[PDB]
Amino acid sequence: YEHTATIPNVVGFPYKAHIERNGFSPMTLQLEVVETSLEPTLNLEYITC
Amino acid sequence: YEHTATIPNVVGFPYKAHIERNGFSPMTLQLEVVETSLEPTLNLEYITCEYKTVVPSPFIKCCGTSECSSKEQPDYQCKVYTGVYPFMWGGAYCFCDSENTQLSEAYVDRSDVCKHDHASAYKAHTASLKATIRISYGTINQTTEAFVNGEHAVNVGGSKFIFGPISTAWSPFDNKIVVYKDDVYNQDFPPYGSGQPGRFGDIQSRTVESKDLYANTALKLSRPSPGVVHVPYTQTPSGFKYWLKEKGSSLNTKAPFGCKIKTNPVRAMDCAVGSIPVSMDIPDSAFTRVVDAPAVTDLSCQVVVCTHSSDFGGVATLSYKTDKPGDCAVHSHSNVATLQEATVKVKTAGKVTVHFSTASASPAFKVSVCDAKTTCTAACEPPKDHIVPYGASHNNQVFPDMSGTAMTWVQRLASGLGGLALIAVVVLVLVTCITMRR
């Protein structure tokens, strides 16, 4: 069953997605972002010392 | 009690026939076609198989002429060649330099395994249906075989059933049929005595045991190479052995209506074609008197869920008043939805659930529970699964009920514009009165 949501990129905000479906009693998911890690691609130009 | 019905020829679709006999509590019979076997009448036209070409040793007459004679043998060929001078391994076979003749002789015969590997050409006509029907009603549940013609009465539980003549005489077999082992071929085989070389039936026999063989292989003798004994000849390759690789896939993979084609005897199973009339003579002992049944009253229906899927995708809860517990017959009086269950225990618990299958966005159908009747109504969503390995249990009636949302909107718009048009009529009639009174 394809369903879509959009959760805040807020760590520890426990967004809850509700699925309503014809055959079935509705379901609430929790989607809690425990961490994010935004990592740049790095090109080394040079070393200084 | 005479009753009549008409069940689809769909195998594994359980029909429900409801009898509302005035003196008795209703009963729902379930009628399921378990198997069908459409069997054509066959006339054997001829047998075909690979030929055997019989080539004796050459009757080489050294130092002399030879006559030759005509013979009755199939495709028989004979020639006497003058001026032969053959060499065997040890020298010339003949002393005379040219006064020798090689009598070449050849003919066609039926192959020695034609008893075992042959194709039979049939005319296939006036097919007949036999069906394996399952009858269940009350405590009686039995599976019986009936010929589907309006004469073979079969007994279940003391009930005569007559499965009347099938609604259409269609069959997947064309008028000309070729049968080979497990396979059946629709094939306009050439008439006996007119088969052509290198094609199916270049040799033809009226039966596998027949003494008389037609052969038309275009066998021709040719002159032997000088000094060589070999009775050289040319002949068109076995048309049967060409056929065996040219057949392609058989009728078992091409018949309409999903028929499964089988040999020995030639038959088409499970053809989903037409419908079968049924006549019942149910005895009085099969019904329960109205005193014995529960007096189900104040019946109402809630559709707990509905998907208009091919399975029994809807669920109803029926609620009751009753004097006693008991079995009631259950039915749906509209073909928009068919019910999985034929009878239910009515309980003092006051409610029961019944499953149904339907194809429409918003069905409404009168269910019943013994005498009580109520109109179930639903909002049914489409299924999410595009393809399923099973046929539809509903009748594929898709037009929505007039109380549904689509017909509600349609009836609002149509009554709106119709009311506006009637008001404009009233205006015009009133004005055209006034303009003639004044």
**Type and span of the H or E element at B424:** helix B405-437
d(CA B160, CA B282): 7
Task: Evaluate whether B12 touches B33 at the Cβ level (below 8 Å).
Answer: yes
Q: What DSSP character marks residue B24?
A: B
Tell me whether B379 touches chain A (CB under 8 Å).
Answer: no
Beta carbons within 8 Å of B201's beta carbon, 6+ residues apart: B46, B48, B121, B189, B190, B195, B239, B240
How many A×B Cβ pairs under 8 Å?
7
Task: Evaluate whether B168 touches B6 at the Cβ level (below 8 Å).
Answer: no
Task: Evaluate whether B266 touches B174 at the Cβ level (below 8 Å).
Answer: no
- Reading the block at residue B203, the tokens are 């040799």
Closest residue on chain B to A2 (Cα): B384
Task: Evaluate whether B360 touches B398 at the Cβ level (below 8 Å).
Answer: yes
**Type and span of the H or E element at B109:** strand B101-110
Task: Evaluate whether B238 touches B244 at the Cβ level (below 8 Å).
Answer: no
Q: How many CB atoms lie within 10 A of CB A33?
A: 14
**Type and span of the H or E element at B394:** none
Distances from the Cα of B122 to the Cα of B4, B45, B215, angstroms? 38, 6, 19
- Reading the block at residue B429, the tokens are 């009639």
Closest residue on chain A to B382 (Cα): A22
Amino acid at B28: T
Handedness of CA B103, B109, B111, B115 (dihedral sign): negative
Tell me whether A25 touches chain B (CB under 8 Å).
Answer: no
First to last CA, chain B: 73
Beta carbons within 8 Å of B42's beta carbon, 6+ residues apart: B122, B123, B124, B177, B265, B266
Tell me whether B358 touches chain A (CB under 8 Å).
Answer: no
Q: Find which of B303, B304, B305, B312 to mutate to test the A interface (most A CBs within 10 Å of its CB).
A: B305
d(CA B423, CA B438): 22
Say if residue B267 is exposed, middle or buried (CB neighbours under 10 Å; 0-12, 13-18, 19+).
buried
Residue window 382-401, chain B: list those with CB within 8 Å of chain A: 384
State the structure-solving technique: cryo-EM
User: Closest Cα to residue B381, out of B302, B308, B313, B304?
Assistant: B308
Is B305–A23 a contact, with Cβ atoms under 8 angstroms apart? yes
User: Closest Cα to residue B177, out of B250, B121, B93, B103?
Assistant: B121
Torsion of CA B218, B219, B223, B227, to 10 degrees: 150
3-state DSSP assignment of residue B407: helix
d(CA B55, CA B218): 15
Task: Evaluate whether B376 touches B339 at the Cβ level (below 8 Å).
Answer: no
Half-sphere exposure in the Cβ direction for B61 (13 Å, CA):
13
What's this structure's resolution in Å?
Answer: 3.1
